[PDB]
Amino acid sequence: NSVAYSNNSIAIPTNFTISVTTEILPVSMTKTSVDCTMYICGDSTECSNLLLQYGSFCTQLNRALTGITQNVLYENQKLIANQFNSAIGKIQDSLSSTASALGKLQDVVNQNAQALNTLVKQLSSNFGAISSVLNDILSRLDKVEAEVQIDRLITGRLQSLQTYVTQQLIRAAEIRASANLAATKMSECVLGQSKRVDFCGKGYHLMSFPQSAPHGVVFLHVTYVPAQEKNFTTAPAICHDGKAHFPREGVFVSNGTHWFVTQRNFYEPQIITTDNTFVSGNCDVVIGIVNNTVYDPLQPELDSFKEELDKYFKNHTSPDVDLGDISGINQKEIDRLNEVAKNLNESLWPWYIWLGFIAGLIAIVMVTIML
Amino acid sequence: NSVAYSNNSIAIPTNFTISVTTEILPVSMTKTSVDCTMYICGDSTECSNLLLQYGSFCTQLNRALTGITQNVLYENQKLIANQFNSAIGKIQDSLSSTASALGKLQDVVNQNAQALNTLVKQLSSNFGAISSVLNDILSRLDKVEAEVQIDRLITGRLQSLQTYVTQQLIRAAEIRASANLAATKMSECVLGQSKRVDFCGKGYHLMSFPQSAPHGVVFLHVTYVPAQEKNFTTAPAICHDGKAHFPREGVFVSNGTHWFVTQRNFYEPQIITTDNTFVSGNCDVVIGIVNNTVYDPLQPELDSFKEELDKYFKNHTSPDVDLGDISGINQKEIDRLNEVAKNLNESLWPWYIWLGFIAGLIAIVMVTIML
Amino acid sequence: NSVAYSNNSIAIPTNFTISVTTEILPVSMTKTSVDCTMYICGDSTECSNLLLQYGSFCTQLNRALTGITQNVLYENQKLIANQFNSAIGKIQDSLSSTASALGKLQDVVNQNAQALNTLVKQLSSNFGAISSVLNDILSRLDKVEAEVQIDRLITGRLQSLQTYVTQQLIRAAEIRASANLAATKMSECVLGQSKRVDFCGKGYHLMSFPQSAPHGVVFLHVTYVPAQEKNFTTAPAICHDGKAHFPREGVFVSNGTHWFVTQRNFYEPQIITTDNTFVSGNCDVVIGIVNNTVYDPLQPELDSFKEELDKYFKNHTSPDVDLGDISGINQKEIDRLNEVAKNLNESLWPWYIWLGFIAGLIAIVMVTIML
Ligand SMILES: *[C@@H]1O[C@H](CO)[C@@H](O[C@@H]2O[C@H](CO)[C@@H](O[C@H]3O[C@H](CO)[C@@H](O)[C@H](O)[C@@H]3O)[C@H](O)[C@H]2NC(C)=O)[C@H](O)[C@H]1NC(C)=O
Ligand SMILES: *[C@@H]1O[C@H](CO)[C@@H](O[C@@H]2O[C@H](CO)[C@@H](O[C@H]3O[C@H](CO)[C@@H](O)[C@H](O)[C@@H]3O)[C@H](O)[C@H]2NC(C)=O)[C@H](O)[C@H]1NC(C)=O
Ligand SMILES: *[C@@H]1O[C@H](CO)[C@@H](O[C@@H]2O[C@H](CO)[C@@H](O[C@H]3O[C@H](CO)[C@@H](O)[C@H](O)[C@@H]3O)[C@H](O)[C@H]2NC(C)=O)[C@H](O)[C@H]1NC(C)=O
Ligand SMILES: *[C@@H]1O[C@H](CO)[C@@H](O[C@@H]2O[C@H](CO)[C@@H](O[C@H]3O[C@H](CO)[C@@H](O)[C@H](O)[C@@H]3O)[C@H](O)[C@H]2NC(C)=O)[C@H](O)[C@H]1NC(C)=O
Ligand SMILES: *[C@@H]1O[C@H](CO)[C@@H](O[C@@H]2O[C@H](CO)[C@@H](O[C@H]3O[C@H](CO)[C@@H](O)[C@H](O)[C@@H]3O)[C@H](O)[C@H]2NC(C)=O)[C@H](O)[C@H]1NC(C)=O
Ligand SMILES: *[C@@H]1O[C@H](CO)[C@@H](O[C@@H]2O[C@H](CO)[C@@H](O[C@H]3O[C@H](CO)[C@@H](O)[C@H](O)[C@@H]3O)[C@H](O)[C@H]2NC(C)=O)[C@H](O)[C@H]1NC(C)=O
Ligand SMILES: *[C@@H]1O[C@H](CO)[C@@H](O[C@@H]2O[C@H](CO)[C@@H](O[C@H]3O[C@H](CO)[C@@H](O)[C@H](O)[C@@H]3O)[C@H](O)[C@H]2NC(C)=O)[C@H](O)[C@H]1NC(C)=O
Ligand SMILES: *[C@@H]1O[C@H](CO)[C@@H](O[C@@H]2O[C@H](CO)[C@@H](O[C@H]3O[C@H](CO)[C@@H](O)[C@H](O)[C@@H]3O)[C@H](O)[C@H]2NC(C)=O)[C@H](O)[C@H]1NC(C)=O
Ligand SMILES: *[C@@H]1O[C@H](CO)[C@@H](O[C@@H]2O[C@H](CO)[C@@H](O)[C@H](O)[C@H]2NC(C)=O)[C@H](O)[C@H]1NC(C)=O
Ligand SMILES: *[C@@H]1O[C@H](CO)[C@@H](O[C@@H]2O[C@H](CO)[C@@H](O)[C@H](O)[C@H]2NC(C)=O)[C@H](O)[C@H]1NC(C)=O
Ligand SMILES: *[C@@H]1O[C@H](CO)[C@@H](O[C@@H]2O[C@H](CO)[C@@H](O)[C@H](O)[C@H]2NC(C)=O)[C@H](O)[C@H]1NC(C)=O
Ligand SMILES: *[C@@H]1O[C@H](CO)[C@@H](O)[C@H](O)[C@H]1NC(C)=O
Ligand SMILES: *[C@@H]1O[C@H](CO)[C@@H](O)[C@H](O)[C@H]1NC(C)=O
Ligand SMILES: *[C@@H]1O[C@H](CO)[C@@H](O)[C@H](O)[C@H]1NC(C)=O
Ligand SMILES: *[C@@H]1O[C@H](CO)[C@@H](O)[C@H](O)[C@H]1NC(C)=O
Ligand SMILES: *[C@@H]1O[C@H](CO)[C@@H](O)[C@H](O)[C@H]1NC(C)=O
Ligand SMILES: *[C@@H]1O[C@H](CO)[C@@H](O)[C@H](O)[C@H]1NC(C)=O
Ligand SMILES: *[C@@H]1O[C@H](CO)[C@@H](O)[C@H](O)[C@H]1NC(C)=O
Ligand SMILES: *[C@@H]1O[C@H](CO)[C@@H](O)[C@H](O)[C@H]1NC(C)=O
Ligand SMILES: *[C@@H]1O[C@H](CO)[C@@H](O)[C@H](O)[C@H]1NC(C)=O
């Protein structure tokens, strides 16, 4: 089911008013080349310095936009003397042995102290080197942790700049088409006279006059709009006994009883003629179908982030450091000596009788002589 | 060499069938604004959190799409006594000296032990701090190593999202042009009648009827297609004696002997007239050349990656740590003493004869008295 | 103020020359699919390996482009013996005590040496682990510091590749429109004859002949250009007593005294008639204004980098490491002993007279006997 022979009330102009139309068309586009430094980063120093590492894409993007008883006592004397002498010998040996052992102890202790001092020096050097290296690590750590975010924001603003570039290229591709439309509107209407409805001025084109504009052209079309029009029932064809008679460069204005081939753009009824109407056969209407399907582009569909990530993403986690736990590396006699020191500090007739006998003997001799 | 005066067999319609054409044109486009979170990252948490750092480009991209024998013994006694006394003095001095030296050794050893304990404590604090700091370093190391890859995939999907945006802007720029074509097809054919071939319905336009569609317009053009046509040899001009006579709004259908100015769209031969043909001079054909060169944009050519990289890329490599190598910091007498200890443990008449003589003397005196 | 009734000198053709126009139109575009590996990174290995982490955007971008005196002496003997004995006892006790204390010192010193060796071993293990871990840290540090710059350049070249993609989609969207123009130029001019000025060949179209081209179509339009034309003063309408008479499919060539409705495309003056001119009322000119405003897209304006940065940017700075400063962990008697050692090395009649008396007594007895 379609609509061919049906006569409906369509307006046919009974009259016109002269008219003019001022039609503006942009024909050129300013080359809006873009500074990406100010656009993406602008005044912030770190992102500006990072943009330098983003290459010359900037000019590249501008590339798009710039175009487009005497004996025993003597024996005891010898005894005490020899005991004392042997004692002296063992004291001297005790002394020598104790001195040697004490010196070896004083040696090993001082060697332990020397090892302590050398270990202290070596460990101090170790700790200085470690502090320096780990400080360098943490400092460059913080710098990288900042710069990765600054670059992430730069990358996210790159998408905005590229959307800007894309929309600008779109606009310039529309500009060149509007310039071609300007060219043909100049051709068909300033050099000539357009026969098409509303083309080159509202109504029907009589004349055109071109004028320039900073990026466009304006046409003053003197035309005529229909001052008055009347709705006549009209059939683009009428089928008489199986033969389709359809007007020749006109329309079947249906009069009260007759069909006239009137002018489409003016009420001027003119009777059906085979010179006013072409004739067909079989009363058959060819049905056409047209769909101007504008191109639908192949949009870039992606996987979900997890699949495209774990495809290459390695989830490497470095281990907790564990290092060696050095925490697991664990007078009475002097009194006796001093006591024995202080303790060692602590334990540090015949002639007369015989003479009397001799005197008595002499006395007796004297008495005997006296008698 | 071109083709002007040559008459070739071109079809001229002997007849027509009435016809209708249903012509669909999309006039509007849905604003397919895009969520970038679901598009790029979707459900994965880490990339979603990272997208927050990518700025509001999302809305920005939507911005595009929402628009668009007694004396000697006494002397020896004195000797042993004085020897013993002097020995005692040297024993006491040996004792005092050994005690002082032994106490100094016991002091320095305990000082070495104290230094050991203090060094152990200081080193334990050192190792705890180092473990904590390097664990922090390695942990944030792993996190950054993951996030840089997650952001790399985000950045690579940003290109897909921007290609989507670009293709959508392309499609909308085609949509607005199809809407303008819809406007002119309404104008020249519903308000009027198109004179152009196949424009507004297959064949030749008789009438049009517009109807809307969710994003388009459909025109029912009642037209006429040529039911029958015959191939007549035709010359767009014929040059009689150096003067080019070319039909006036018609074509030179070459009859068996004559040229007729027939209607282009219908076989209706009509004899050459100067009202049927314009006349030229010199038989000269102007040759025109036209190339509608669609704009070829300035594509953003780049250097190779090495030149744009080493331009700013610094290949800094931190050195291998080297730190101090602390690995390079390297009884007989007691027996004699004990032996001498245990060794030191080990070496810890006249009256009668004279009385007999006196008795003999008294005996003699008695005998003498008896005589 | 506009321009309707004013008659200006416009050229009307007095004559024509036959002509031909060779019109080339590109109708198809080669699918310039792009390898992103060679484009962005090319031959450099590290950026190539990094591109693998950028996902399959490559094909996605191709998705766009592929489409689109005896007793005292004895007492002194006992004295020296007991003094010596007690001295021996205190020497033995001094010996035992000194030996025990010296052995305890030799024990504690060797324990200090053992603790030194164990601490050395534990610290060597600690230093080896620390060196390994911090070397790993610094090495992956340098690698990440290089890769972030390589990826930054990749991301900056992604913008160039996307600008290329956008411009290519622009070009293909122009290609399909040029193909539609080719379609209509074939329709209205090879199947028919164009009535529009310069459309399908310079001048006025007589015939067209289509021919293919690797991505285009060329039409040979036999047309006629105006050989001669004369500038006649012309008014698209003239207002007689308030009624606008404007020519019917012609122009008012202003003769010396009269207006003729001449053919626009040929000097053929024909007198004003109501069949040559439509008539209006009130002498009123309708003034129309038209501006074909090509779509200006909503460009993605961004904040300054600081606001979009500090929105999520955290300026975390890890502290300077400070670790424990281990630098803060700080014979006369033997002479006396040896002196006393060497010093200790250093201090290691009655019968005859009575017999003579007895002999004198016997001598006296002998003398007495002799008397
Ligand atoms: C039709 O409407 C247009 C708006 O959609 C508008 O075109 C505009 O014309 C002005 C003229 O003042 C332009 O303004 C500019 O002024 C000068 C001259 O071009 C330039 O040097 C400036 O940099 C600035 O761009 C507008 O740019 C222009 N609009 C657009 C979108 O380009 C007019 O009202 C009509 N068109 C014409 C051509 O007049
Ligand atoms: C369409 O039908 C209309 C109605 O028949 C017709 O208009 C009519 O035209 C006739 C002829 O001119 C007139 O007939 C009478 O005209 C005058 C009166 O005006 C008399 O003096 C004559 O003797 C004659 O009887 C009708 O008056 C007139 N009717 C109307 C309503 O205008 C159209 O001419 C027809 N159109 C075509 C193209 O045929
Ligand atoms: C990167 O880091 C996460 C580590 O915290 C990582 O997670 C872990 O993935 C492994 C391997 O898929 C899982 O190991 C076990 O997984 C299932 C769960 O029961 C078992 O059947 C397996 O046999 C295997 O033993 C861990 O369970 C999982 N851990 C967690 C906490 O999820 C993720 O892949 C990454 N994280 C992010 C946010 O991307
Ligand atoms: C010409 O062919 C077109 C296909 O190239 C197709 O246009 C399509 O029309 C349908 C109508 O059902 C649209 O479908 C949609 O349905 C409604 C109404 O628009 C929307 O709300 C939905 O979201 C959905 O988009 C198609 O979208 C549309 N095609 C395109 C590419 O837009 C028709 O067959 C013909 N055109 C018309 C206007 O009918
Ligand atoms: C970043 O890291 C690479 C280091 O492994 C770096 O490479 C090296 O570049 C230097 C600079 O030219 C070369 O140095 C020297 O080249 C020769 C080799 O002996 C000498 O005779 C010269 O006098 C000069 O001193 C190194 O040779 C080169 N490394 C190697 C192993 O050849 C690269 O620039 C970067 N690597 C990547 C993958 O981008
Ligand atoms: C109108 O001017 C065009 C230049 O703007 C140019 O079209 C060009 O035609 C040549 C033909 O040799 C193409 O060259 C190519 O050659 C073959 C055939 O297409 C291809 O396989 C090659 O890969 C190569 O592309 C040009 O590509 C083409 N120009 C463009 C921009 O596509 C002609 O001078 C005129 N047009 C025609 C259709 O002839
Ligand atoms: C526009 O005005 C022109 C000037 O009046 C007019 O041309 C004139 O046409 C008349 C009639 O053909 C000529 O009148 C004379 O013609 C010949 C001489 O050539 C005499 O034999 C006749 O008796 C008559 O007197 C004029 O000579 C001629 N003038 C010129 C300069 O050509 C145009 O015809 C007018 N155009 C229209 C459409 O009316
Ligand atoms: C990231 O690193 C910079 C650190 O070097 C950081 O800068 C510092 O920002 C703080 C926060 O405002 C400022 O702090 C104090 O500033 C004045 C100084 O006394 C006080 O009166 C305020 O109350 C506030 O407490 C620091 O002064 C500022 N650093 C310096 C040297 O001025 C920046 O935000 C970041 N740097 C870059 C390049 O982005
Ligand atoms: C060992 O014996 C001596 C002698 O009895 C004592 O020593 C005297 O020590 C006091 C200590 O103040 C001095 O004031 C005296 O001058 C010392 N005596 C002499 C003679 O000088 C004491 O019992 C022991 N000596 C010590 C412990 O040094
Ligand atoms: C020093 O000499 C004494 C006395 O001869 C000895 O000591 C005795 O040691 C034994 C060891 O078991 C004890 O059972 C005895 O009781 C000790 N004697 C007395 C009287 O009690 C030994 O040769 C030396 N003393 C030592 C080595 O302590
Ligand atoms: C203790 O006294 C002895 C005996 O007077 C001295 O020793 C002698 O030491 C010298 C050292 O060269 C030897 O050559 C002699 O052979 C030793 N004497 C004997 C008998 O062998 C010395 O004054 C002291 N002994 C020491 C210091 O060992
Ligand atoms: C055409 O109009 C006439 C009167 O104006 C009417 O009688 C006739 O039925 C109409 N044709 C159709 C097909 O409706
Ligand atoms: C229409 O035009 C005719 C003839 O030109 C005239 O008689 C009639 O009055 C006009 N009507 C209007 C409304 O202009
Ligand atoms: C090491 O020190 C601990 C402290 O708790 C103490 O018991 C002892 O002196 C050492 N440990 C051992 C097990 O010897
Ligand atoms: C035109 O056709 C006629 C017959 O149809 C023929 O005689 C003549 O040679 C043709 N013209 C040319 C230039 O071939
Ligand atoms: C063509 O039209 C003519 C006149 O209208 C007619 O005589 C002839 O039969 C028609 N031929 C065909 C094939 O329709
Ligand atoms: C340190 O230890 C080594 C172990 O090989 C051993 O020879 C000695 O006791 C020390 N080294 C030196 C050179 O004194
Ligand atoms: C039109 O031209 C004629 C002579 O060619 C002149 O007399 C008249 O003034 C012109 N009309 C206008 C409005 O200038
Ligand atoms: C213009 O055409 C006419 C008639 O065709 C002729 O008389 C006149 O000489 C031609 N003039 C030129 C310059 O061709
Ligand atoms: C530790 O060494 C310093 C070296 O300057 C020295 O004065 C002393 O032996 C120790 N320091 C103290 C305060 O005891």
Numbering used by the authors:
A (entry chain A), B (entry chain C), C (entry chain B): 703 to 770, 912 to 1173, 1180 to 1197, 1212 to 1234
Tell me, in the authors' exact words, what the paper reports.
We found that only local searches with C3 symmetry with restriction of the Euler angles that had prior values during particle picking could yield a high-resolution (10.9 Å) map according to the gold standard FSC coefficient at 0.143. From the averaged map of postfusion S, we clearly distinguished the head region (connector), stalk region (6-HB), and TM region. The in situ structure of postfusion S of SARS-CoV-2 has a length of ∼210 Å and a width of ∼87 Å at the ectodomain. Compared to previous recombinant structures with indistinct TM locations, the TM domain can be easily discerned in our in situ map beneath the HR2 trimer. In addition, the three helices of HR2 could be clearly distinguished from the helices of HR1 in the 6-HB region. We noticed that our previously reported crystal structure of SARS-CoV-2 S 6-HB fits well in our in situ map, suggesting that 6-HB is highly stable even on the membrane of natural viruses.
The SARS-CoV-2 genome encodes three viral surface proteins: the spike (S) glycoprotein, envelope (E) protein, and membrane (M) protein. Mediated by receptor binding and proteolytic activation, the S1 subunit falls off, and the S2 subunit undergoes extensive and irreversible conformational changes to insert its hydrophobic fusion peptide (FP) into the target cell membrane. Subsequently, two heptad repeat regions of the S2 subunit, heptad repeat 1 (HR1) and heptad repeat 2 (HR2), form a stable six-helix bundle (6-HB) fusion core to bring together the viral and cellular membranes, leading to colocalization of the FP and the transmembrane (TM) region at the same end to form the fusion pore.
